[PDB]
Structure 1
Amino acid sequence: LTLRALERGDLRFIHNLNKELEQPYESFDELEELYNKHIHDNAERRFVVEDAQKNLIGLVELIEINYIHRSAEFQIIIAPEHQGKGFARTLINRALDYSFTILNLHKIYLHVAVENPKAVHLYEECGFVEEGHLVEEFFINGRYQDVKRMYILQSKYLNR
């Protein structure tokens, strides 16, 4: 599985990929114009993961890149077809590899719903550690829910 930069040609597929069960209700024209607005935005990175047969496995994103503090929020989404194939670990470390060996970032953090303990333990297996329990951070499905903020530092990923 390779890590490629997302380009305008991939927007149609991710638009249908977002439709899972905010983003599912986004107009494609808004998605495209917003993509055009962030072409040169150095504060974000949008990568599409594909296999040898150029099949879109998922999307890994880095947002809120600071460069002074050298931190960035991490996000990942895998198409329903490839959820249970065990790609998550590979894509996570693939994004951490780019963040710590190429972009030279110091910290990578992410948010996960407290009501998804399987996802929490997954990131724990990839090296992430809980640093916060945000109370009623996001309003998800008719109710406010807590989310875990988990992080991992450059030194730890490099000294595995």
Structure 2
Amino acid sequence: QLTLRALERGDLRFIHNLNNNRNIMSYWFEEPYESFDELEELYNKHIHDNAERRFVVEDAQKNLIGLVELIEINYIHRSAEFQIIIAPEHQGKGFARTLINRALDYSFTILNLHKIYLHVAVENPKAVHLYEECGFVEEGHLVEEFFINGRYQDVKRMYILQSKYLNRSE
């Protein structure tokens, strides 16, 4: 039913809408941005660049569901950071697992990465329990990592490995 498509220029206005509400400073290849035109200029500059890969998610009706990002990709350590944003009008439909699995399948089969980690705000038990459900395990509890909404907040770092993902059924 659900599909993942590599991101392209048409998709930017959708990206841009996503990067509002949850109200961090957003980034594109580590360069920060607030406005469409800013983003568009960043998009055009880093079109060649492989440190980050993005995939829009649409359904069988082409409703734009959410975004799967991979950043900080390193091909020596063979690792990457993953995050995911679902559009508010599509949360609570059970989609997030399917997507995480598709991110992991891509990273661990096509990109051939060794390790995917991610970050979840400690003041968000639900997500933690979700990534836990999907294979992730805590490797860190990072104290005062980010200033969000008025204060420095803690976040869990969580990770999964390739042989685990691919071979844990054998």
Q: Deviations over 1:58-106 (max 9, x none)?
A: 0000000110000000010000011100110011010000000110000
> Is the contact made by 1:15 and 1:24 (CA closer than 8 Å) also made in structure 2?
no
Aligned length: 157
Structure that is richer in strand per residue = 2
SS at 2:61 equivalent: coil
Where structure 2 has 5 or more consecutive residues not aligned to the other structure, the ranges are 19-28
Q: Runs of 4 or more off by more than 6 Å in structure 1?
A: 21-25
RMSD between aligned alpha carbons? 2.5
TM norm structure 2: 0.88
Q: CA deviation at 1:37?
A: 1.5
Separation in structure 2 between the aligned mates of residue 110 and residue 116 of structure 1, nearest angstrom: 14
Sequence identity percentage: 99
Separation in structure 2 between the aligned mates of residue 53 and residue 28 of structure 1, nearest angstrom: 26
CA shift in 2, pair 1:66/1:138, >3 Å: same
Q: Deviations over 1:95-151 (max 9, x none)?
A: 000000110000000011000010000000010000000000000110111000000
CA shift in 2, pair 1:25/1:45, >3 Å: closer
Aligned residue in 2 for 1:56:
64
> Is the contact made by 1:65 and 1:72 (CA closer than 8 Å) also made in structure 2?
yes
Separation in structure 2 between the aligned mates of residue 23 and residue 65 of structure 1, nearest angstrom: 16
CA shift in 2, pair 1:24/1:43, >3 Å: closer
